């Protein structure tokens, strides 16, 4: 179910068994759904006959390439089965080996006979601030089941198995997102899209030409400056790691769902890596870094198209302003993304992003991103109080 309408007409046979609030109830409390467990199942959960668990060492280039291929062929698609995420191998290493990562939390399923990788789910550790509480949690990502293995209850087994492996490390809460509605969103965000190469976007039917406008007008409407305008904008360097950490920490205190990063985590998540993560800082006339912008690189496969095979998309990450207006910062982010060859620049309506989306000519998308907490009871919040961006 994509809608709260479709979702309220469902029975959740799996999620009813899990420590999450029910879709119907409204929460007026703050705390764990169930107490921490002091004994944990030692045996992996049983898979259907012919399949076996395998923890994936992503430092083995061949195993990383198998994961790349599983996701490239079987991961998330749009509503109409026209595009599929195409996470790169180097991107997967960034997202799956942050500080504190564990090999057992790269939870794969293989065919016993052939060794083909047919299922995956991952956990990475994260300190999460939720209202007045800071808790060690995990972030769950990359839940994937091979197309030929679908509708056979493999996803519930993957969820229970990663839960067990996380419990063994003494963590009892998780955060995650999904394009579907499940019990029970803590916040609902909407993707918006800023055209950078409008011709390609229209040709591949990522976007359309309205009856009201022509292609010629659409090009001029989305034209951007050649170079960014903000004084002293430059890529993040090693010397900026402490101040980016400081800026981010103070900026995030205004939201209700945020990461709490160490300085090593800031280095990991923000230090620029070509074709994975871009961070630009504003260093003023006194030599002080006062703002930064960042976006990550996530291309997509275009299915069943003879000429255009891929869409290059930039995703707004974390943008912190203390002296430069956010509108100016985001304007320069668009120019930088254009300069780097991106076809589109995506951003959610969370944090303060609503203040610039329409002004900078973003168009609303057809996809909601729901945010979820596992085994944590708290009231829902508006998109503008969500201060957490995953991959």
């Amino acid at each position: 179910a994509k809608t709260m309408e479709e979702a309220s007409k469902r029975s959740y046979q799996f999620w009813d068994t899990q420590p999450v609030p029910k879709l119907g109830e409204v929460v007026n409390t703050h705390g764990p759904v169930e107490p921490d467990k002091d004994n944990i199942r030692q045996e992996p959960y049983t898979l259907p006959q012919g399949f076996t668990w395998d923890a994936l060492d992503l430092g083995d280039r061949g195993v990383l390439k198998e994961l790349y291929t599983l996701l490239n062929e079987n991961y998330v698609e749009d509503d109409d089965n026209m595009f599929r995420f195409d996470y790169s191998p180097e991107f997967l290493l960034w997202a799956l080996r942050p500080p504190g990562w564990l090999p057992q939390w790269h939870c794969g399923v293989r065919v016993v006979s052939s060794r083909k990788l047919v299922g995956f789910i991952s956990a990475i550790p994260a300190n999460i601030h939720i209202y007045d509480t800071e808790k060690k949690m995990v972030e769950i990502n990359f839940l994937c089941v091979h197309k030929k293995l679908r509708s056979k209850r493999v996803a519930p087994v993957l969820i229970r198995e990663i839960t067990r492996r996380v419990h063994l490390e003494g963590i009892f809460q998780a955060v995650y997102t999904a394009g579907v509605v499940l019990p029970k969103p803590v916040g609902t965000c909407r993707y918006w899209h800023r055209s950078l190469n409008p011709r390609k976007l229209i040709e591949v039917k990522f976007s359309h030409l309205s009856r009201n406008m022509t292609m010629q007008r659409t090009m001029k409407l989305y034209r951007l400056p050649e170079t960014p305008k903000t004084a002293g904008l430059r890529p993040m360097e090693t010397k900026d790691i402490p101040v980016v950490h400081q800026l981010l920490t103070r900026y995030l205190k205004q939201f209700h769902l945020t990461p709490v990063m160490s300085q090593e985590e800031v280095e990991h998540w923000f230090y620029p890596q070509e074709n994975i993560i871009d961070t630009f800082v504003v260093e003023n006339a006194n030599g002080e870094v006062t703002d930064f912008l960042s976006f990550y690189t996530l291309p997509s496969t275009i299915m069943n198209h003879p000429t255009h095979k891929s869409l290059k998309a930039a995703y707004s990450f974390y943008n912190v302003h203390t002296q430069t207006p956010l509108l100016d910062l985001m304007s320069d982010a668009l120019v930088l993304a254009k300069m780097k060859g991106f076809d589109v620049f995506n951003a959610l309506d969370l944090m303060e992003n609503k203040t610039f989306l329409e002004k900078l000519k973003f168009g609303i998308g057809d996809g909601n991103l729901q945010y979820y907490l596992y085994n944590w009871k708290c009231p829902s919040m508006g998109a503008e109080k969500v201060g957490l961006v995953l991959q």
Binding site: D78, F83, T177, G179, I364, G367
Partner: peptide, 8 residues
Amino acid sequence: GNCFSKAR
């Protein structure tokens, strides 16, 4: 996981 959105 993330969600794939296109222009509404």
